[PDB]
Amino acid sequence: LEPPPSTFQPLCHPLVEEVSKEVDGYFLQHWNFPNEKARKKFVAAGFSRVTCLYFPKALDDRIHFACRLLTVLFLIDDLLEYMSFEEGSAYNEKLIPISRGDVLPDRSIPVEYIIYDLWESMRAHDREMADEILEPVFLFMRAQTDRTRARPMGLGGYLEYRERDVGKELLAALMRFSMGLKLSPSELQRVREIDANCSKHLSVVNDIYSYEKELYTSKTAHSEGGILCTSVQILAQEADVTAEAAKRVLFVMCREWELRHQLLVARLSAEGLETPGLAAYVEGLEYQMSGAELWSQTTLRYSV
Amino acid sequence: LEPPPSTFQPLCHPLVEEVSKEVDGYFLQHWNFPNEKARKKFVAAGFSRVTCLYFPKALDDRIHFACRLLTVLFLIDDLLEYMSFEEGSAYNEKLIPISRGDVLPDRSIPVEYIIYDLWESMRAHDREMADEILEPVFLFMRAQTDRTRARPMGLGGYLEYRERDVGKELLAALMRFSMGLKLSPSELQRVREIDANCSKHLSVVNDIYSYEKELYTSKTAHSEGGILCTSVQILAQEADVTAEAAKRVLFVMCREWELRHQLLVARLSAEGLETPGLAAYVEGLEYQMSGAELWSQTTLRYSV
């Protein structure tokens, strides 16, 4: 697998090591892992490492929050593959009022009190910025079990759906939270087109590196929860080529999106619309794209 | 536009200079051009040159037939852009009985007697092989004004339609005729997968190089006949990139179809299915793909 050249340079949060031990340690203590093999695979994935690659400029005392949220979402993402759409939906919907703090968790159920305590701790640190992550998370959760996954999609329709399933919006809200980066509604409206383009990069890069894993899952897990829903197989079907061929083509498209990102940001600046906050934001998006790819290239989650 | 590497070596018929002079001269005498500018643009296109690139192993006394047929089809292809779907259909349908030789041509109408005299001359040289080109040509002609051109299509649906609009079948039958290459029904059914793959390459390579021409046509010609129907526009729409970015990505896919062509040929031979006739056929298809591309890179039809 040979990735075409990119001009995006990845950055990792300085405290990645100590935060990793902290967050992995917490989940190894509280989360219901089935066995030792699963615990080792969990650590081998490096969910805090990818988070620190996502948000390398996160504040030192907020990066752990982001690591916890993405870690539990990664774990749930895998759980859903053994469920039907119905079971998966019931599972996520139960966590939504708990995430809001409107419903108390069952303390005997790890996922519930982990989710509850997390959001409570985030609201305690920064109430306004924490609340703005909620609905983007709920949007992502509901996309995970959407029956549209089991229906024919073209590349365009897929990317539109996958913007929710890849959690583009929650990642943006979480990035801002972790950086303490407050943006006005008008500012956010200005970078909407940039966000949409960034989403496609995130989605397809992940699709390429995680295809072998998801292929195996589709053959072994639940026929619904583990269904093969990805740009790799969509393009392979549309063009009647192998998945390996589709990856090579999609890789080139990812670099086109990197080029579009730079063009859109350059236009934003030229029109005098790139505020200091917006400048930090679009740079943050670039970190997400390059960080995700670096991790995807090396994580044992995708290679084994 | 820098084309990605291809292992295909394009070949041109040895008699290209003499035949091009002959056929161009024929159409300059008989065809009705609006002005001297159109007459020069016609010669600059090199319609006999691309034919000799399509079928470089055509027999020396048959290549001029192919040159004449593709030339008039190219001319008509352009005429249809200034018509509605209804008018274009009426234009083509009148030429079909004349092509069969069932209806005498109006000698005052160039397109009618050119078509009549051509097909008569082809049946005179090789009746059986000439007749086998008829229905594939009619299939192409009727695709040109198909209402599906005015309906939204995905990449997969488009390529299935374009196989007829790109004249894949007529090119196959014309190639066999020009080479005197006879194949059994068993041999023909055997390579349907190879044909379908080849068709995609012919279509998308053409879409890439002819996009600028067809963009202009969509803005100036008839709202129906000049409508933009191309994989470049479809991929640009679905992936949210420029047409130029779509071209670069589609070109990579074309190289994947080239690889798949070689894979399918090797498999046909790895089994017990590659006859000497089939070997000549699939090699001929490679010439169509590489030849069309070579011409598309230098013809004034697409550059200006």
Ligand SMILES: C=C(C)[C@H]1CC[N@@H+]2CCC[C@H](C)[C@@]2(C)C1
């Ligand atoms: C940033 C990405 C490409 C996605 C990688 C996979 N994970 C799964 C758990 C939830 C995350 C938001 C994400 C979908 C992000």
Ligand SMILES: C=C(C)[C@H]1CC[N@@H+]2CCC[C@H](C)[C@@]2(C)C1
């Ligand atoms: C071989 C091709 C890529 C097509 C180029 C355009 N011409 C138009 C006139 C009729 C031909 C069959 C073709 C559609 C072939």
Ligand SMILES: [Mg+2]
């Ligand atoms: Mg997953």
Ligand SMILES: [Mg+2]
């Ligand atoms: Mg998922």
Ligand SMILES: [Mg+2]
């Ligand atoms: Mg994936």
Ligand SMILES: [Mg+2]
């Ligand atoms: Mg046409």
Ligand SMILES: [Mg+2]
């Ligand atoms: Mg045309």
Ligand SMILES: [Mg+2]
């Ligand atoms: Mg064209």
